[model samples]
Target: IPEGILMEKNNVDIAEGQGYSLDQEAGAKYVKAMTQGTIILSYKSTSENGIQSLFSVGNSTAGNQDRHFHIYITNSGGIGIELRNTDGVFNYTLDRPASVRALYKGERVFNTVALKADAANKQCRLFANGELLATLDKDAFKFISDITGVDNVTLGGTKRQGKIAYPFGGTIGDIKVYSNALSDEELIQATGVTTYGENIFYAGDVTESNYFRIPSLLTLSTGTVISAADARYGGTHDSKSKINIAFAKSTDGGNTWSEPTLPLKFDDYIAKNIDWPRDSVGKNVQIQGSASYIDPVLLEDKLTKRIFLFADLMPAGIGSSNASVGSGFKEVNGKKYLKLRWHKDAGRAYDYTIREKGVIYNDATNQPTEFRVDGEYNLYQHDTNLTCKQYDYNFSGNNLIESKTDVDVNMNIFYKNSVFKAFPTNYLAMRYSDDEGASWSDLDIVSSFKPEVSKFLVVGPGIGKQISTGENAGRLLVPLYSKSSAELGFMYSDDHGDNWTYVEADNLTGGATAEAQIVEMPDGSLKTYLRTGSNCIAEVTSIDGGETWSDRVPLQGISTTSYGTQLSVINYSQPIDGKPAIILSSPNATNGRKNGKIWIGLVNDTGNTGIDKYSVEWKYSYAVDTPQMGYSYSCLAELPDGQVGLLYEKYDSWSRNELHLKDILKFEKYSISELTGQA
Candidate 1:
């Protein structure tokens, strides 16, 4: 299309582990001598995981086989380039994580990718869908001429060490190689693509994070809409990775939003955007020693006007599945303090405690060490304020390598190289904001109330509830779940969040209840909708202000997968059809996390009393998208304009192959009439 096309192939099916090669000698001789060039490809990927090469040029000779120049795509919809010269090597990746495996408009679609290696400018640029995505100028830029013995031109795979490696599985619409580099305008015209829509937190929006999940949304009393999610820096895995709670607020409903902030975050590990590898060896890779905050829950105390945010605090290398069954605390002189064991004293008993004012006390000597932890849990030496360096990681030939850069950082026990280490367990942390999310208070460890025998206790990712009627009015309530003693729990603050009290809903142990949301009924009683392994939505009612609960009831109307997804349920400020109503959002598919639907149920009170007296009539159901689109974790809040705002993960987040997705957390607004099909 732009002239000087050395080789071109169109509408070709390249099966797994198979490819084609073109002879450069049969074409223009200038192709082998070109120092700068461009490669344009239009293709549709069949497999969503693993490394797949689209084009490559290399020396195929024995003992000298190497794909000196290659363009490839990763499982998470990322574009990468690898170029090597005798003197230098350059490698970079442009990660645009998304669910590209789904067909577009019920038909396979081609994604245009263009790479321009400008050796004269010493830069390499990557473009997806005709828009510039990334540039690699920090490395030594090499081109076709720079490679030694470039005797092979490969398509659908790369020749390395005498064999085809990184074979592609897909259909190629066309591929064109040019002997000369194309300008941005020419490349855009050749690729023929455009983009649309708004993404609040995309892959490249924040420098430290590339993936986001588990959205939490809330509309404050002041008409400001605030949202929070997991800023997954390393990858999209749940825990044992670098994750921070990212926050954003919108004063004018959902039209505009402020820049995101890490209101609840830890610095034990450097947060960098990395495309977590999906190969056999790379699939298990994790940032082993990174303290993380996950599954945020937002609430506002209407009386005090103070907003509270809570998230699961993970010690390095610990997640819900691997966390030890303990509170990770020790009591001395009738006061509970976070207990720690020195790295050198590991495998032995813990002999230290973090006392008041962040002091580290030696239990054996009854004396404080020179080191102390700040309110944010950063370890520091009392006198010098010296802290250790944070660890960073990268993949070197499918192996995760930890970096030891000379960068100063606040140290924490979870870091690989720290003086002390906390017990590998889960904790809950909280922070409050007064000025409508303008700023936040210091960290507060609220998991001291965790049951001693529980393996994990975490917040139900969504907004919390505040009682508005009856004797328990104004009490702040946040839903919680654990792996022992009880399936559902609540932490309520009677004195406007100054202090909290923990209460378990039931005594049931080893149940399927987890990740829930509370909706206040007309009688001031609370009902929690929770996820379960029973392939259906579960509910329980608390009659005495969340202090006690009834047995679990499986909702018969909703059919979901056995592995249930987190759902959102909130009270509608106004009544629908002359009756108080509640709105519930979740995925309705029984096979996978798809077919998002919202339901409106009208509440009716019978003559009887207690939790059994109230009944909910399912009135209307609304579909959020097509039945095939992914719908995972979601949050719903009532906007000041009376519309419902939803922030949800738009793709399958639980699949191992679907990790590291970008722009999958989408925000949408819908009016009640639009949702219920009522005037």
Candidate 2:
């Protein structure tokens, strides 16, 4: 619109496998000869997956069309450019790092995307919604003149072998191709879109991690709100990669937050953000031997004023799906201590154990060596504090290269040159904070209560519950799930978390129950709402303290996908309409993680005893966003001023195509009346 527009098209809808050809037009010659130019389009995509081409130019001949230029969108919502010359092909991609994709809407909302090419500067820039997304540069820029046979120009698809390839599936309101590259100001003015909202943890918030998932948030008694999540450094794949538990706190009722910290983390692998490959192999790509932490849970003891954080601990490359069945500890002198096996080499048998107080003992001779491990698991001289350097990995094309940096860190068994290793299994570790999250205590491995036969037992993300009534008052209960004997588990602490006990809620070994949250009733009973393979949410009540549970009751109203998503439920401090109430946060869509809604369920007293004494009547429902927006893994907490604080993942973190997203975890506050439409 600014100037030099060689071609312009407005209000066009191109169906799938169809295109608009411009090769015979007068501007085709100008497009073929232009060295520097800009292409801008307002488009809306109906599909979220696959390569959908927006514009392309290529050879018109059949079977000899290797030379071309393409601008397309991928399954992961990324914008990509492919320039093919006779010598080679150059590809540049700009990942959709925010919550919304460039063309996220359907037929109604159109998004602007622009590409500017500068042959003199050897640079290419991509802009979406008026914001510059990515800039790519190469020694030899591939311009329109670089391709030899540019006899075809197509919109809404790429031409290949005399047919349209990678056809687009959406509407294009307008498109403009200019002979000269446009300025940023001009492009921004034309697009006229801006991003909004507050992100608690976004990409690059931590230098080491670019992806976060499995949110956990809790509000202490003194008005401090804390959040914890998995810092998935090697992409969003669950485990068997470099991961750390990132933490942050807000003191002013979710208005402002402190910088993030890795309170519960392991140093086995270097944690750095990388553009994970997006092909079929992307699902299996991982740092094979990185000890990681996944799925954080936060709880506080009102009596002691202590805050506790729990997460599943994976020893170097061990994830829940493949964890070895063991406690990862050995009984020594009538007391169980964390045991370690020493591997001399890659192929040799591990024939040594680490004894009490970091002593490395030979199994053959029962003798200790001068080499021992420090408290933080760093290998050191028995008396001195000399440790080895941690190794880092970088991608050289499709291969991975390890670089030994000068920075020294603790020795991990997964390190290429470390001597000692923890048992390749899963454990539950916790840390406690006393000064309102100012600092944290030392690591506490509570896996002694873990069943030795269980392959995997881990914390369910979000807040834990503390009993406030009856005989079990002051008891702290955290939700858990396992893959072994029972589908759901619980870890409780009666003595202000100094000691703990494990209790399985059900005996069903192969049921589809996992990732649960607990809410207290007016009569001091506990009801746990859990995710299940069933399309509806399931609930189990415990009349006594968290030692037992009732049969699974599938809630009738809520519908979700078969691959269920994590949900949040909390007991409201105040009742709604003269009845006790609870709040629930989850996606209501059965197809995808969309249609985020919050429901206020008023507790009804049936005037009975045991599990039948109480039932919930869902009285009101509120839509958090439109039905199409993403809504996954969320956490809800009661703010200091009685407002409800919701921190949630704005996109589906489980999809392989949705990786490398940034600023997708958003925080918002709503009042009870706003949520329920009641005074």
Candidate 3:
């Protein structure tokens, strides 16, 4: 603690050797910033899909490299933040998946985030906190002017060159700074006020960066026998079908992936039609029939150099008399399985919308009051949560729909989505994996014991993620749902992923809607986010290790659609340099599913509070070529050369159809802050 800061308790989560004991850990709360200038916040951090954290703004051109600074938490070896010497342009950050040191894990912290201007004989001072933590001046990076104020000092993410960014991935609290060398009283105050799970902005769940640039299938390659699924007749008929599994191999670290090829080809349209079979067993699924693999995924063997391909099979449009060869039909038991295919395409891809909403500028109109430095930004659509029930599609419609329940959890590798309704039919129908297309684990359905769940409806798992370090290192999860059409619940596993448990979920996030995601802090607690029925992603949290949760904390960062959102760790057991980095990927724009983009985020422990802080970096990229309508049922992974990989569907969401994907099992890594739009 700073010398002058008179903290009531010495056991806070910020600096080491002094955090509250586990049994005494508290929820994330924003502590005051005793001082400002160049402050560094430390906590265990994670990266999304292996992309480098925005670090700081970039030298975009000759115009502003100085304006481009690294702004992410680096306490756990990877987190770091840089503020361009501007009056109000700061980009928060997350740790990348490549930190060589085994960054500490857990949301709770007992570390320091010191701020020094220009050390090494430059204009700098030491605000040292952590016992073994590195000094912030190591980079020797120079800033033009002193950071006077930040526009939006968000915890997890703030808007970047283009999109809302990534959240940092750790516990963060006790945000103490020292403008004056600090007296003992000031140190005591900072010590007494700092809590676990908060940032300078007082935003809970602010340790990890939620918006970093995640990798997707931009250009991939595949061998022979590969195919992409193109649902004919929007899953009505499987006869006239066409799909391709395009892939490319990058011999050089993402500089150039090879010209892709389809794994399967019909030589010349053999007159024979066949039935494609698809079934689920636990988290395992296999399909074969007249159906074609419309969205093929190219995956690399973790221990080998060979690549594998996978895709949803769709059969359609062929003049055949074979009983097993029905048009627009996915043959199951001699007869056609039509319902299984109708809403399958919709569940196969994700889409949403976005409003430019313009920018945030200084409003000097209000006369100076107490003269304080502050910045705030909110860019989101009004609560579109449950309101969608009354739209073109009635709430009680018999049509089945896909929703995301689990999320940016599980070290960011495997994410879960399920089919829901008055009586959810397909429980274990969710898809997830981390090996960049190598293997896919089917979904595990967690049956509910509640009235709503027992009603005319069944329950399935929502967004689920895993914790990488600390006391609860290998826990896997599945949030819950009830008999009612809306409320949610939690189903999690403490043992890597064997059996599961449940904690009744409170439907406060956007109301009556259960599409949600979860992020586990270094301290084993969980922070939840929901995809409102109306059209936005809201949030919630649990202080007691998934036992109970808080109300919805809406994030007004962007305007979104009713499409399912995803939260996952790119690499499950894979570690960067020996330390595991959690990466998150999701769409930044609501243009359409076809325009799907992935943002990388860093995960870390902030204040040692069970709840985590996410420092999200924002960057976007489109891997598919579907015109105007792209969808993403994406899975992420970390690869061999410090790069990231993804497995997703290539389709035009509006038409509820599939496209011939050239790189289903796509792979790539970016250089520095490589983002999609005008960044």
Candidate 4:
């Protein structure tokens, strides 16, 4: 065999941890020379800066160590190889280019570097990728040179100029190099390649998807804590807007509250503090501010405790995005018509893109055929709003002079195209929080399917009012009203808020209905009060917790849905004059939007949760408009301080559009001696 010395290979795997004590992060490839003849090892790499791991020749020793021809790679495009020098300078070749698409771990590609230093001539040559990658000549006509720091050469990371880290992820298999600056044949036989893993972990966490809000009960010391033990009540988020929950709790006797935690919300600082009813996504979407976490009537199960939350998530679109019956973006025949893009008659203007044609699909893959890239690379134009680019609108005298763009200032769009349905604005979602309000499970739809339950949300759910009577002292009476077609529906929960069953198909609420509230009767029956949209209140009775019901009826004299109509009630069992009694608080009449009076309803044998029927007969006089605005979403709860408390949304829902946006979202508090009796 005629040996002229001409082939080499280098292999290394230390991607995870930085080599040589991490003076710097490492990546990419370096080399190793076993027996240098003319062959120089080469491989692909994804290494960081200041580190090299390759082979070389005609190079001098490094830092007082052995000297010889050597080769290697360094982080930051650092490539060096030097041989014997008397001026203390080593013979070598190097490459330092500005940052390239520097491969991070798991993302490296292969490239090779081959060099040949001729002791026979005084010139040196370098080849990258079988062809000539680079060439150099300075090393000497010298033949023999010892290599320093070569005793135990490593790969990836470097020790060239002090300790540095070089992880070199990616892979590296075949590699080759030449000794005498290889000819075409030698370059053909000596050139090889290496692959490496170079993907790196930057920032990530596991708990990014879960959002939780804590809950506590009504305790004597804390006013809200564990039930039955010196605690008069409990408070939990209704999963409604913050203002909705705040107002619901304000009635619970000034219970101290923790900083409100937002679990499911996407509005800005402004939207959160107020009940922008008109601003919600659907028709007349209102937030009923009552909290329901445990089933009042049902017992707790051993395996999976029964704690459910039922909140009506309505579709009151924000700003001018909502559509009602015959309004806004009318194209096509369904929900997609409401999208801003469909303002045209049916198929003009924005119809060029298939995505604008209402969810078109790719025939080959069944995947959604999306619109082409936008101002931002491969992203679609409609989605550009999500980048927070405010919809450009000119302002003239405080009012929007002209809307240059229809997108919102936040530049975010969600649930596009499929935004509307003839389906009533409100649907019921039942959820359960397990760890005292810390976490909740998937939402279970309760209404939508049941005609009896669906009727309530059409107009609106009266309230998440509770009626504790009989052995089943913790019953939740959920009321609903439908205006498009006058009808009422009721949903009740018995098993501590776990399982919910609705009233059988047929139900009634007088001739017509609007807004209303409910209270438990002394005989373990239910009484409902509703709005005729004018000055007439409608009533209904349920013998069971919505299990069975009595025929529809109307109450005379009580101002039907009149001015400033607020409903606040409590259970009673007290006896008045030998018979059971009942007492309730609401504007006695719909009087010009004023809180003029709180009325008392009296019924016998009906010591529902209230003993004897109803005992105490006292109406606290409330000044008309002492605070300025009207009232909405009022709540009632017995406080741990042995007194009754009331919480109502601080602002008048009807007046939120003008000013004082911050105040509207807050829930105000009120005190009461006894809702139905004197303690």
Clashing pairs in 1: 97-662
Query: What's model 1's lDDT at 81?
Result: 76
Q: Candidates ranked by TM-score, best first?
A: 2, 1, 4, 3
Could you report the Cα RMSD, in angstroms, for every candidate shown? 8.1, 5.7, 26.3, 27.2
Off-target runs (Cα >4 Å) in candidate 4 are: 1-255, 267-309, 316-414, 417-425, 450-476, 484-486, 493-513, 551-557, 560-566, 572-583, 606-633, 649-679
Model 2 over residues 145-261: C-alpha lDDT tens digits?
Answer: 777778877888888887887778778888889978888788867765633346677676763687788888788888888898888888787887788999998988878889988
Q: On a 0 to 1 TM-score scale, where does candidate 4 land against the true structure?
A: 0.42
Question: How high a TM-score does candidate 2 get?
Answer: 0.80
Q: Residue 40 in model 4: shift from native, Å?
A: 91
- Tens-digit lDDT track for model 3 on 1-679? 2333222222123222112222122211111222233344433333332212322223333323334444443322233444454435543222221121211111233434443443333333322222111223334334422333222223333335434334344344434322334333333333333222111110011211111111123222222111122222112122223222233334443444333333332211111122211112111111112222232333332223233333322222221112121122122334322122112445422111111121111122312221111111112123211111110101123232222222221110000111110111212122223433334454222232223222211122112455545556555555544334336666555643445565666633332435455665444556675555556656677766666777766555544566554433333234322332444454444544434444433344354433444432322333222123244444454444434544443232223222211222223333212323332
**Candidate 2 lDDT trough over 10 residues, lowest sum:** 98-107
Predicted candidate 2: what Cα RMSD to the true structure?
A: 5.7
The predicted structure with the larger lDDT, 1 or 4, is 1
Cα-based lDDT at residue 275, candidate 1: 75
Alpha carbon lDDT at 155, candidate 2:
80
TM-score of each: 0.76, 0.80, 0.34, 0.42
